[PDB]
Symmetry: C2
Subunit: 175 residues, 2 copies
């Protein structure tokens, strides 16, 4: 069970300790999503293209709170990373989705992330991963902040670093 | 399983986030113990005089790492405080014991804590709690740091606040 902390407490430092707490795995990610949307989010599901998470998505994330989640590559001598999608059903029946991609091979790939509000209840799956990763303009994990109007009177402001031990911090707020 | 982070990452803010993650309970405590003793610690056990914890002590806390732990009122409708002792067996065969006491009723009680190294492997129990509280001069949760040489070439510096939403952070280092 991932933690649900005060929105204002989410920071790079909290995410870096989550990363430290995961241990010396080659590819891992600490994810923080601050809910300032004015609507309560209810965990829907996650989908991992590569890797796993030892924890589950926090069930409820009220406005003013942030969820902490993490993921990592499958354990053992396997050249893979941590890539997946987490989805939350918003109070209005729409789905907030977050993509994270921490590849094993940095010679040909880079870190990417994305966030999007889908209409209606949309579970995370292979299609959503492909949609978010290839066709819906993901942001690079480039050690820089990125802001995007999500429609529905909200916007996201997020940051993801460039390394294999990644942190992804996103704030969803009212436009 | 409580988190094991880099010792230099342990801070009041990290502990404050651990507290928030426990949700709205009247009595709860976030404990952080940074091992800079020069010796590896192996979890021994915990003893709760009041309250409980929904996690266990991280098994191994090597030099340079800090353990994160927590406690709270009893599982159930019965409102209590969070009072107990956690014990770690150091590399030399001696036991690092830590007392934390967050009472239910502040009219007659206050926050207290204590740190002490026992000779040999000594499991936390009712007796160790009695000793650390009634016999061995515990420190008050008075928003102040307190230093005490522990013997074995080590000292402890700790801080605890005074509220029912308690934070106790201790650094064990070379004297």
């Amino acid at each position: 069970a991932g933690a649900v902390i005060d929105g204002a407490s989410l920071s790079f430092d909290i995410l870096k300790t989550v990363l430290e707490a995961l241990g010396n795995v080659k590819r891992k990610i600490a994810v923080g999503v601050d809910n300032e949307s004015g609507k309560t989010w209810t965990a829907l599901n996650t989908y991992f293209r590569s890797g796993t998470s030892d924890i589950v998505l926090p069930h409820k994330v009220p406005h003013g709170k942030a969820l902490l989640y993490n993921g990592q590559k499958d354990r053992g001598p396997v050249a893979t990373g941590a890539v997946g999608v987490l989805a939350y059903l918003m109070s209005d029946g729409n789905t907030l989705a977050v993509l994270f991609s921490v590849p094993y091979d940095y010679n040909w790939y880079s870190n990417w992330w994305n966030v999007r509000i889908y209409k209606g209840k949309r579970r995370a799956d292979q299609r959503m991963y492909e949609e978010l990763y290839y066709n819906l303009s993901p942001f690079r994990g480039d050690n820089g902040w990125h802001t995007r109007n999500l429609g529905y009177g909200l916007k996201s402001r997020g940051f993801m670093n460039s390394s294999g031990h990644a942190i992804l911090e996103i704030h969803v707020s009212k436009a």
